[model samples]
Target: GSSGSSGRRHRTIFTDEQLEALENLFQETKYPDVGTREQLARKVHLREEKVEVWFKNRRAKWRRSGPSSG
Candidate 1:
């Protein structure tokens, strides 16, 4: 059997509860600091890095669509 295969990773999937929590936090702060980010990660049972990435993408989307429920 071949040991080496394509570098693949499981895409992170957020649950309904997790998404709600994340959205609530995002509403509070467009850009959360380290402390706030850590707290949010803990609250959502996600890694700090995951939270960071979410916010990164979220900011980009927010910028593209001026927060009008899109």
Candidate 2:
């Protein structure tokens, strides 16, 4: 039983390229500033907030997993 913030059991299938980018971005800018996030977000598709969210999640996962887990 998982309680995702948005509720409902759905998934966002981030492609391999997107996945790679997520990891790369995290390493490139471990702490993305407000403007830096928007810049990186524009580099990819989806809303700006998505990029912001990805940065947050990626960073968490990187640290929590030591750059190799979830």
Candidate 3:
């Protein structure tokens, strides 16, 4: 596993509520500004780094997962 910034592999299991919040935010906009990221982190009670990574992974998955509800 990559050391990454945390210096170890840490898998975060986002609860359904968290997923819903993130999904809604994603639908509004994929690339949220740093200010928005910090806001979301506060809103979701998650680390800013996690929210940043969540957006990254979500965008990649959204691409690979293919278009939906289009």
Candidate 4:
């Protein structure tokens, strides 16, 4: 009688190349245009939507770990 049974086992893992390409773009630019994401999606073999979402998530993380000139 678990509360959250079958929590939807789904893991959209990314390949090393995929992570490399994604990280490369992120380092160059925190945010890219729709077209750029679409192009990157194909290069990474992932969906465009995911690429967009990843950027958003990555940006958030970057902001949290931003320079501390306090």
Q: Clash number for model 4?
A: 0
Looking at model 4, the pairs that clash are none
TM-score list, all predictions: 0.67, 0.55, 0.68, 0.69
| Local accuracy of candidate 1 as per-residue lDDT tens digits, 1-70 | 1221354334477999888887888889877789988988989899977887676567666768886665
lDDT of candidate 1 at residue 31, scale 0 to 100: 70
- All-Cα superposition RMSD per candidate: 8.5, 5.5, 5.6, 7.6
Decreasing lDDT order of the candidates: 4, 1, 3, 2
Tell me the lDDT of candidate 4. Answer: 0.76
Q: Local error of candidate 2 at 15, Å?
A: 1.8
Candidate 3 lDDT tens digits, 35-58: 888888878888778877777667
Give stretches of model 3 more than 4 Å off. 1-10, 67-70
On the 0 to 100 scale, the lDDT of residue 18 in model 1 is 84
User: How far is 6's C-alpha from truth in model 1 (Å)?
Assistant: 21
Q: Count steric clashes of candidate 2.
A: 0
What is the C-alpha lDDT profile of model 2 across 1-70, one tens digit per residue? 2324665433366777766766787777776677766776666665566765666565556578795665
Candidate 4, 1-70: lDDT as tens digits: 2322555323366889998988898889887878989999998899887886666667655767887432
